[PDB]
């Protein structure tokens, strides 16, 4: 039921999605090990993901969270990188996209920093890098990230350096407490609390 609509680079929606992608790049404490060395991306394509059933699944759950949290969905747009982005756009998020070894438990992880999600495109810790060259820092191969609408609801705040949400909460917020430049990361425990709105195809760019 999924169709992908290609956005024109002249569309304001293309532009605002690209800007969120580029502006949320940061340096990482692994010196680029997982995700490569780059300060910015070459955005190749931005597609709107359209699936009525997956959307209504999202909005149904959003209303439930909202009504449990004084009419506040606490909805964000967050990045998600994963080897399984193609399963995700067709079938939605579910238990199989949970990070079992994650620091906030076995849920589905999202990032404010596009560059954080980039580290997961080829697997946990970047896996063995790109299929074709085995290069975690490949500048040639095309990568994809999802920019997702996520319902956080009442989020459990965890300061720091499929399971269930903490009792009385709808998500976990991993608040960075050491690296002053890191943005927040988030975990939901229900696949229906995220909708993969944009598929972004890109390459990381070698600095000069």
Ligand X SMILES: O=c1[nH]c2sccc2c2ccccc12
**φ/ψ (deg, to 5) at 37:** -105, 120
Among 17, 21, 49, 82, binds ligand X (CB under 6 A): 82
| DSSP structure string for 113-175 | SHHHHHTTTTSGGGTTS-TTT--TT-SSS-EEEEEEEEE--SEEEEEE----PPTT-SEEEEE
Residues 200, 145 contacting (CB under 8 angstroms): yes
Stretch 91-130 residues interacting with Zn ion (CB under 5 A): 130
**Nearer Cβ to Zn ion (133/164):** 133
Among 61, 62, 116, 170, binds ligand X (CB under 6 A): 116
Stretch 84-103 residues interacting with ligand X (CB under 6 A): 99
173 is a site residue for ligand X (CB under 6 A): no
Among 80, 136, 170, 190, binds ligand X (CB under 6 A): 80
Tell whether residue 141 is among the known ligand binding residues.
yes
Half-sphere exposure of 73 (CA within 13 A, CB side): 16
132 contacts which partner out of ligand X, Zn ion, none, CB within 5 to 8 A by kind? Zn ion
Q: Which stretch binds Zn ion (CB under 5 A): 67-75, 111-119, 137-145, 158-166?
A: 137-145
Distance CA 127, CA 7 (A): 30
81 contacts which partner out of ligand X, Zn ion, none, CB within 5 to 8 A by kind? ligand X
Among 52, 60, 96, 133, binds Zn ion (CB under 5 A): 133
Distance CA 119, CA 123 (A): 8
Tell whether residue 138 is among the known ligand binding residues.
yes
Tell whether residue 130 is among the known ligand binding residues.
yes
117 is a site residue for ligand X (CB under 6 A): yes
Pick from 185, 52, 164, 170: nearest CA to 111: 185
**Nearer Cβ to ligand X (8/198):** 198
Q: What is the binding site for ligand X (CB under 6 A)?
A: 79-82, 99, 109-111, 116-117, 120, 124, 185
């Amino acid at each position: 039921g999924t169709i992908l609509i290609d956005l024109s680079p002249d569309d304001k929606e293309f532009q605002s999605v690209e800007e969120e992608m580029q502006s949320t790049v940061r340096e990482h404490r692994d010196g680029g090990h997982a995700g490569g060395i780059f300060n910015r991306y070459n955005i190749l394509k931005i597609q709107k993901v359209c699936n009525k059933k997956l959307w209504e699944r999202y909005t149904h759950r959003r209303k439930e969270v909202s009504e449990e949290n004084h009419n506040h969905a606490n909805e964000r747009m967050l990045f998600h990188g994963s080897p399984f982005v193609n399963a995700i756009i067709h079938k939605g998020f579910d238990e199989r996209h949970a990070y079992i070894g994650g620091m906030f438990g076995a849920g589905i992880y999202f990032a404010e920093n596009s560059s954080k999600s980039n580290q997961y495109v080829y697997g946990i810790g970047g896996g063995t890098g790109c299929p074709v060259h085995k290069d975690r820092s490949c500048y040639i191969c095309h990568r994809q990230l999802l920019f997702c609408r996520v319902t956080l609801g009442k989020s459990f705040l965890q300061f720091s350096a499929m399971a269930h949400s903490p009792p009385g909460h709808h998500s976990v917020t991993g608040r960075p407490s050491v690296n002053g430049l890191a943005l927040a990361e988030y975990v939901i425990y229900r696949g229906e609390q995220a909708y993969p709105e944009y598929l972004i195809t890109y390459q990381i760019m070698r600095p000069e």
